[PDB]
Amino acid sequence: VGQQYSSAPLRTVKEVQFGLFSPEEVRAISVAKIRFPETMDETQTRAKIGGLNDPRLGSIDRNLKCQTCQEGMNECPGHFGHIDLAKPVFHVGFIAKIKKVCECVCMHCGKLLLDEHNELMRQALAIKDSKKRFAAIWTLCKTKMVCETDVPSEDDPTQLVSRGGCGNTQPTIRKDGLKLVGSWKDEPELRVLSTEEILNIFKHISVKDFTSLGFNEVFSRPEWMILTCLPVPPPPVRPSISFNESQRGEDDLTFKLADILKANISLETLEHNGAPHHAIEEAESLLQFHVATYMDNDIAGQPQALQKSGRPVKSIRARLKGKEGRIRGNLMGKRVDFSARTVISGDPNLELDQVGVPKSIAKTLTYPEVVTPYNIDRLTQLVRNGPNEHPGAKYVIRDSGDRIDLRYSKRAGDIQLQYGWKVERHIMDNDPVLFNRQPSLHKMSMMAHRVKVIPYSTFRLNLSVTSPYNADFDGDEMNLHVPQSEETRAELSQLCAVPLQIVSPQSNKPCMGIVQDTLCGIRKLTLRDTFIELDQVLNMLYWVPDWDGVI
Amino acid sequence: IFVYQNNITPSAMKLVPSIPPATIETFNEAALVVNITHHELVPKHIRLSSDEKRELLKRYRLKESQLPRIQRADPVALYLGLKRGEVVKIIRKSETSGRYASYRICM
Amino acid sequence: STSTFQTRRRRLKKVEEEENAATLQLGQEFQLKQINHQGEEEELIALNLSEARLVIKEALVERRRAFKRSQKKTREKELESIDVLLEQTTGGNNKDLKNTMQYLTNFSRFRDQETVGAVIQLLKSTGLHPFEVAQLGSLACDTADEAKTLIPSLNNKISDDELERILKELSNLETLY
Amino acid sequence: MFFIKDLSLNITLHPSFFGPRMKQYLKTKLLEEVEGSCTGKFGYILCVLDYDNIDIQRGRILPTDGSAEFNVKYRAVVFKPFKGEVVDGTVVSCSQHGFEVQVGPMKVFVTKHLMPQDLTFNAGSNPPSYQSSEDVITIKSRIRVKIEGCISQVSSIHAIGSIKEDYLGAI
Amino acid sequence: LRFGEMERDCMIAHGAASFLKERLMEASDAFRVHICGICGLMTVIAKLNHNQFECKGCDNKIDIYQIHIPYAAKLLFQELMAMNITPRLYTDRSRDF
Amino acid sequence: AGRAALYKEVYNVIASDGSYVNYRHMALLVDVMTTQGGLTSVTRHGFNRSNTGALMRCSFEETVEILFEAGASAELDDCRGVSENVILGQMAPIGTGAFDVMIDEESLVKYM
Amino acid sequence: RLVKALEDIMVHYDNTTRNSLGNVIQFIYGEDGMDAAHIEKQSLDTIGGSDAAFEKRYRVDLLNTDHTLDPSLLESGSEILGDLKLQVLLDEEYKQLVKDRKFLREVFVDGEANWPLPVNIRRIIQNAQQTFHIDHTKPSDLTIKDIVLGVKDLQENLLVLRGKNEIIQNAQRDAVTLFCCLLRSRLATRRVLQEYRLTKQAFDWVLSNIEAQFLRSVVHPGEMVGVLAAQSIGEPATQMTLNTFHFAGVASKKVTSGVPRLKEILNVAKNMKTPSLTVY
Amino acid sequence: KAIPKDQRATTPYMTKYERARILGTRALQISMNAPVFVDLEGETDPLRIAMKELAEKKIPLVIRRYLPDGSFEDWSVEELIVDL
DNA sequence: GGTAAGC
RNA sequence: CCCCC
DNA sequence: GCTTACCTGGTG
Ligand SMILES: [Mg+2]
Ligand SMILES: [Zn+2]
Ligand SMILES: [Zn+2]
Ligand SMILES: [Zn+2]
């Protein structure tokens, strides 16, 4: 299920280990170096370049060409490349954490501002939950504004023991946009702390110290919150919408990456050349801007990295942010195949658990049946019927993977079925199907029904089942979902079947009764005054399917 | 148990944990005026022995983590003088079953 | 592919892969302290070709017994004899086993299980590594110098004299082919 | 060397085989998959022992597919070569670059330069040989080699060998 | 049609586990990835026809797995990776709890 | 007593409206809001800030922020929650997923 | 928010209610271990009325001519008068029924008798009478032992929890406390004979059915109880109003109510609109 | 860690979910041409066949009930009581 | 444009 | 947008 | 005790 046999063992995910990329790992997992803002045109020749939007990272042209892997569009996950940053830059997502870590460590020697020699600190270091522990250590260390050489000994308060020298005064760090500014102590020494400066002291934090802060020696060292080697995501993440040959619109990410690239080439040029040093600070802060603005383009610090159109550039963070987001809109909820929707109509002649399905829908929706000696003859007949007669079939899936399209196949008239083949046949009477009415507020908003293929364009349902759905026939639309396994259809029939939902466990009472015409007519039928003579009594008895035949 | 009128000076409050294994508990006179355990909404909380606790965890196949928790500062935890780790059995009346017992681990 | 009994430990930690030698640095998979199916710690099983030849022979014989039970509802000579058993139990396609049996039958020093048992007894008193014990049963040495050169691991472990007593005994047990 | 190892293979069996002679087919698929195989990790998985007692265990039926996956716990004879292992073998091929030696299931190749200077290749001889002041090495001759190193090659391990050092060579 | 969040909630309430997976996988975007056994990443350079596996910079080739995940999650993970986050997917439990 | 009062309060809002919910539902909500020792709001600050797995918590409200913190603190999601199995397209340990199904070769033989 | 907060709550194979971390939320689902679809409002008789009427309805005194069981009610009636050995049994029966009434009056302080419980006992007896064609003008073949000990044994098989230890066995005793109160109150010797007029065959069928029905009623390990609760509180919330103004036109009488009060609650809002003490 | 037979404490009755999964699993297998342990007296639907195999208690499957700690109780579909 | 938990 | 309980 | 940073029903 992602096409074509893989010899690799298939397993399920049991654990997800979150972490941060070391720059060394980004280089290790890279396929292409990435160095030109240019995406394509080999000078002018329409084909992708050795710089951006890959050699290598994946493909376009629905032409296999995916670097040696050579697997082609559906099969190929893209491959990451990298871009080496001319100067280190903070990751937006970690700007605050960086501030807090600087606020916990001596900005000179990299030691923790407090230790075991402080009673309040000991209480915090004891904290089991890393998140709560870092919050405590910070609340303590933030105020500590000197890297004490010696502190009073555990026994004698008059005497002191050397902890870990340095003795340097710490700044009072304030965030100025994407910059971190310090104020040491006449009037205070005000200076902006460089990324390199921070990175360096983060690199100098003891494992014991960064493990005391929320960090991980293996998976997430604090120094990794500072970016140095940027992973370039492959084309599948940033697809180039091709408007048919020599006309292709690249993704916003592709454009942003080109800006990161251009800003970087710029900085690397001045750094190498006659660096005017007050020009260097500009190209540096610009690189910082693009790298920030690529991941998050909704920062408090107003300038909203715009597209030349006046549009604001879709940050990666923006793609994930809920309802329409990646998580909420694509993972928690999906748009799905084997589905149908029409206007619902009511039917007194359908059993409580049946659903009237328009032929057109029945001929579209298709359950895939495995050729077995029990169905071999039946399925053979549906294949013969083709995709246009009601009891029919659309495709025949062979042992040999590929599916036969009965509407086009030259062999569609022939086809001698074999055990194990799947016949994708039309939805038929008594197939269990999931019927739904949005908003789905209850378990009873979705119930399994037995198909009843019928004429006309409406899903027809039994009047009694109207109430659980909270549906009426003033043009309400309802949804149908077709189960595809002999296993999922058993879930529907054995768990979600309409008759199984009769008593609701919300209110602890039944959730379906007799309604409207029948409720009105039942009172009328059952008064003393109401008598029936033979002629009708017989038609009335004949109407009860289960009648014993006894007058 | 120290029953003070208004307040215990911070200077004196420092001496409190200074004598282990003995534990000092400070209660304000005003707090003790009414016995909160007597309230309509307050059920019977019972202090479990180290062995009774061992069994509870065994029988439900639990990590201490997975037990419902009671704060150390909890009016009832303070009343029983519950230490951290101590489990309390809670017998409440149920409108569903007649009686229902919960457990809370003092953290 | 096939897995083992040695439980996976290092998280990411890349791959700090170490070399394998005769400083008895056989893999992680070939450590002295092994863990058997039953869960217990077992010592490494290393076989001398002879020990090895008989293990495979016996294993294949019991397989034909099981295969015939379920079907209801002298070196030159021993060489053809084996090719019959293999053509009966083995998948045919297993050339690796056929090449092995020809090798093992042509290079075993000890024919019978009594002689193999005697070797195995003698060399077990030594308290040497299962690798050195298997090499002392597979390579025929005359002097402790031969043994100690060919099996470098042995070096300070056994006395030159004690080793020489052992090689005299192994030479006496050597089958007259 | 030539070890015995406790191992376990995961086999996924299709519903068609969920009949009485099921274990019979699992033990079969185990011998196909595993026996005659070679890994850098374990070496050559030469022969599965105790056929009468191979452990099937229970098999989990897999969610959307009907198949059942068993971890077949077993015990086999393996051959894993090592650097510094002294092996006895027979000469198979022979050239101006050296000679290859059959050692059990694998080949150890000896370079002209990883053999004593007096051993000189003779193109002439039938079959081609390596001769010295008192020795002749050709196809079929027995040699004691010291493995210099190994290479894991998909379904085989090969090695470079020496007969330069003392007590190695013809036998 | 959208089988949304609320719809997912009724399948949960129903206890229709297998129906739910089918609706999100087979009925929508099931995809197959090759995961390295060392870093839990989608690094594996799997050449299927040649049976070549490889995760360079793990120097794998051997410890590799096939996983079935919704393409949108393959996307989510590559997006998180693009933001220096490593969502390492493992096929065994290290915690054992 | 806090839980007892909270139930009384939750009940009284639903019931004043005329509406009826079986006890066990409100009981459960009130219990969830309470097992942590104090009052845990059904908000992004409340329940969503608990020790539950990253991916599950990111599915409600603080999506990206949750995932960054997950990365920096090297969080381990055991995929025990529904949301995690939904994101991974795996059968959740829910209802028909709350147990395993095995073939018994012993009985498989006995049935022949 | 309700759904997202309760998502992961499910009933485990140990009848415990747990979340994704495996933390216990409820030790037994909804305190009783019963599935809400098998719960029906039933009347706990014993709780109300005068002590006199209770005594009339339940007390059987074989040692007293006026308060014995009438020989018309059971065949045993004539020889049961003065039986000290059986009176010790009826003395237990009455003592427990009193103990029950005392306890019910502790649980439900207002005296409210109607509570949703599993197994509609009214119907079982009703059906037993229509099945065996109960003759309310013929003496019963039941014994006092048949009744007294019969009910006692049934209580032993009303299983919610299983475990061969005191924790589980006590937890089991507890879960069944309120049901057994109803059971004992409905199958008292005086009630069974003088009201229901059951036969041994009929009474047996009743005990049998109560057992079966009770078992059918317990929650199923795997129930996604969390979402269920979230949706059960969610759907009525959907129908509440923002405004209401039922106390408008009278200030100095203000209440928060409806949606706003539901938010104040779920948000554990610190600055609530209508704070109020009710001092007794 | 597997709770031994004599020490099993879970319900003797098959859960509504266990049943649906068995019938589903067995129908699936039957539909994939798996061997049938019942005499199909003219039956054809893999679910209707599975139901027969269930009713005749000739389903060779076992449920592995997992407790929240990881330990488990294996239960045969033979010994499990199908009421419902 | 409403609430709270940051500084 | 323009439609919904 | 003020400013920030999160959120705001369902389909089509
Ligand atoms: Mg309408
Ligand atoms: Zn590729
Ligand atoms: Zn310092
Ligand atoms: Zn890797």
Strand partners, A423: A369, A396
What single letter denotes the amino acid at residue F20? Answer: Y
Answer whether F26's CB lies under 8 Å from A509's CB: no
Q: Do the chains F and E touch each other, judged by at least 3 C-beta pairs below 8 angstroms?
A: yes
- CA dist G40 → A329, G36, G137 (Å): 40, 9, 32
Are β-strands F99-103 and D86-95 bridged in parallel, bridged antiparallel, or unpaired?
A: unpaired
Range of the domain at H39: 1-84
Rounded to a whole number of angstroms, the distance from the CA of A219 to the nearest CA of chain C is: 8
Q: Three-class SS of residue D6?
A: strand
For A55, residues 6+ apart whose C-beta sits below 8 A from its C-beta are A31, A32, A48, A49, A67
Distances (CA, A) of A295 to A195, A257, A292, A398, C30: 18, 11, 6, 46, 48
Please identify residues in chain E, positions 4-33, with a C-beta within 7 angstroms of any atom of strand K. 4-7
Which alpha helices (DSSP H) does A276-423 contain, by range?
280-295, 316-320, 359-362, 376-385
End-to-end CA distance of chain H: 30
Closest of A500, A383, A492 to residue A430, by C-alpha: A492
**Residue E86 CA to chain centroid, in angstroms?**
13
- List the A499 CA – J2 C1' distance (angstroms): 37
Regarding whether D48 and D31 lie in a shared domain, the answer is yes
User: Following DSSP, what letter does each residue of chain C receive, concatenated?
Assistant: --B-SSPP---S---------SSS---STT-SEEE-TTSSEEE-EE--TTHHHHHHHHHHHHHHHHHHHSTT--TTHHHHHHHHHHHHHS-SS-HHHHHHHHHHHHH-S--SHHHHHHHHHHHHHT---HHHHHHHHHS--SSHHHHHHHSGGGTTTS-HHHHHHHHHHHHHHS---
- Indicate the length of chain C as a whole number: 177
Instruction: Name every residue whose Cβ is closer than 8 Å to that of residue C63 and which is 6 or more positions away in sequence.
Output: C89, D51
The count of structural domains within chain D is 2
Rounded to whole angstroms, how far apart are CA atoms A9 and E34?
A: 10
Please count the structural domains in chain H: 1
For the CA of A349 and the C1' of J4, the distance in angstroms is 28
Distance from C-alpha of C106 to C-alpha of A127, rounded to nearest angstrom: 68
Name A430's Cβ contacts closer than 8 Å, sequence gap at least 6: A450, A451
Calpha distance E36→E65 (Å, rounded): 6
Closest residue of chain H to B57, computed from CA coordinates: H69
CA distance to A204, A420, D72, G71, H32, per residue, from D13 (Å): 54, 15, 12, 72, 12
**Residue span of the structural domain in which D51 resides:** 1-82
Contact: G36, A441; criterion CB under 8 Å: no
Which ligand sits nearest to residue E54's alpha carbon?
Answer: 4
Give the C-alpha distances (Å, rounded to integers) separating A380 from A392, A393, A399, H40. 10, 10, 16, 22
> Which ligand is closest to the CA of A163, given by its number?
3
SS3 at position A26: helix
* G78 within 8 A of G1, measured Cβ to Cβ: no
Instruction: Please check if E36 is assigned to a binding site.
Output: yes
How many domains does one find in chain C? 2
Q: C87: which residues sit within 8 A by CB, 6+ positions away?
A: none
The whole-number Å distance from A477's CA to K12's C1' is 10
Q: Identify the domain boundary among D23, D57, D82.
A: D82
**Cα(G166)–Cα(G157) distance, integer angstroms:** 17
Q: Which residues surround ligand 2, an ion (CB under 5 A)?
A: A 66, 69, 71, 76
Amino acid at H35: P
Contact yes or no, D with B (3+ CB pairs under 8 Å): no
Interatomic separation, CA of residue H65 and C1' of nucleotide K1, rounded (Å): 56
| Dihedral of alpha carbons A206, A208, A212, A215, sign | positive
Calculate ∠ Cα E37-E43-E48, nearest 5°.
90
SS3 F64: helix
- For chain B, list residues whose CB is within 8 angstroms of any CB belonging to chain H: 61-62, 66
Burial of A26 (0-12, 13-18, 19+ CB in 10 A): buried
Residue at a domain's end among D82, D98, D116: D82
Contacts of A17 in chain C (CB under 8 A): 11
Other residues' Cβ atoms within 10 Å of the Cβ of residue C14: 15
Estimate in Å the CA A300 to C1' I6 gap, whole number.
15
Ligand 1 mean position, distance from CA D130 (Å) = 98
Q: How far is the CA of A228 from the centre of ligand 2 (A)?
A: 26
Whether the bond between B21 and the residue before it is cis, its omega within 30 degrees of 0, is yes
- In angstroms, the CA A161 to CA A423 distance is 83
For residues B5 and B29, is the Cβ–Cβ distance under 8 A? yes
A257: CB partners within 8 A, 6+ apart? A52, A83, A232, A238, A294
The answer to whether A232 and E84 are in contact (CB under 8 A) is no
Q: Residue G272 CA to nucleotide I4 C1', Å?
A: 14
Return the CATH number at C94. Answer: 1.20.1250.40
Q: How big is chain B by its Cα radius of gyration, in Å?
A: 16
- Which residue, among A231, A108, A226, has the nearest Cα to A170 in the 3D structure? A108
CA nearest neighbour of E16 among G123, G129, H21: H21
Following DSSP, what letter does each residue of A95-150 receive, concatenated? HHHHHHHHTTB-TTT--BSS-TTSHHHHHHHH-SSHHHHHHHHHHHHTT--B--SE
- What Cα–Cα distance (Å) separates residue F59 from each residue in A525, G96, G233? 55, 53, 21
Residues 6+ apart with CB under 8 A from D154: D38
Angle among Cα B4, B8, B10 to the nearest 5 degrees reads 170
What is the side-by-side order of every strand in the sheet holding D129-132?
A: D120-122, D129-132, D135-137
Token pair for H70? 């990881």
Q: Which of A467, A463, A457 is nearest to A437 (CA)?
A: A467
What is the separation of C-alpha A478 from the centre of its chain, rounded to a whole number of angstroms?
Answer: 27
Please give, rounded to a whole number of angstroms, the shortest distance from the CA of E34 to a CA of chain H.
Answer: 28
CATH number at residue H79: 3.90.940.10
Q: Give bridge partners of residue A334 from the DSSP assignment.
A: E3
- Kindly report whether the peptide bond that precedes residue G116 is cis, defined as omega within 30 degrees of 0: no
Pair (C82, C38) in one structural domain: no
Q: How distant is the alpha carbon of residue A93 from its chain centre?
A: 19
Closest CA to A238 of A286, A294, A306: A294
Q: Strand J: which bases are under 7 Å from protein Cβ?
A: 4-5
- Number of CB atoms found within 10 A of residue A84's CB: 16
- The verdict on C97 and C162 lying in the same domain is yes
Give the residue from D28, D59, D82 where a domain finishes: D82
Q: Which structural domains are found in chain E, ordered by start?
A: 1-85 (3.90.1800.10)
Mutate to test the interface with G, among H7, H15, H74 (most CBs of G within 10 A): H15
DSSP element (H, E) containing A339: strand A339-346
Return the number of other C-beta atoms located less than 10 Å from residue F11's C-beta: 15
**Resolution in angstrom units:** 3.3
Interface chains of chain E (3 or more CB pairs under 8 Å): A, C, D, F, G, H
Grouping H, G, I as helix, E, B as strand and the rest as coil, residue F88 is coil
- The answer to whether G80 faces chain F, any CB pair under 8 Å, is no
- Compute the nearest-CA separation of A356 from chain G (Å): 28
Q: What does the block give as tokens for C122?
A: 């003698």
Residue D62 contacts residue D69 (beta carbons within 8 Å)? yes
Domain assignment of residue C13, given as a range: 1-46
Residue D89 shares a structural domain with residue D165: yes
Residue identified by tokens 């599950």 is: F56
Query: Do A357 and A364 contact (CB within 8 A), yes or no?
Result: no
Contacts of A90 (CB under 8 A, 6+ apart): A98, A178, A180, A195, A198, A225, A226, A227, A288, A292
C-alpha distances in angstroms, A364 versus A335, A434, G173?
17, 16, 57
Tell me which residues of chain G, numbers 251 to 270, contact chain F at a CB-CB cutoff of 8 Å: 257-258, 261-262, 265-268
Nearest-by-Cβ selection for G228 from A503, A505, A508 = A505
What CATH number does residue D102 fall under? 2.40.50.140
Question: Rounded to whole angstroms, how far apart are CA atoms G224 and G231?
Answer: 11
Q: How far is CA F91 from the centre of its chain?
A: 16
What gap in Å lies between CA D165 and CA D148, rounded to an integer?
11
Q: Going by CATH, does the domain composed of B35-107 fall within 3.90.940.20?
A: yes
Closest CA relative to residue A479, chosen from E15, E17, E3, E20: E3
Compute the distance between CA of residue A338 and CA of residue A344 in angstroms, rounded to an integer. 18
With CB atoms and an 8 Å threshold, state whether H16 touches A489: no
User: What distance, in Å, lies between the first and last C-alpha atoms of chain C?
Assistant: 40
Between positions 2 and 21 of E, the ones with CB within 8 A of G are 9-10, 12-15
Contact A68/G at CB under 8 A: no
Query: DSSP E strands: which ranges in A136-204?
Result: 150-152, 160-162, 174-176, 179-184, 189-193
3-state secondary structure of A516: helix
E15 reaches H (C-beta below 8 A): yes
Grouping H, G, I as helix, E, B as strand and the rest as coil, residue E43 is coil
Same-domain status, C81 and C30: no
CA Rg, chain C, in Å? 19
Distance CA A167, CA A146 (A): 6
Closest CA to A374 of A311, A417, A434, A437: A417
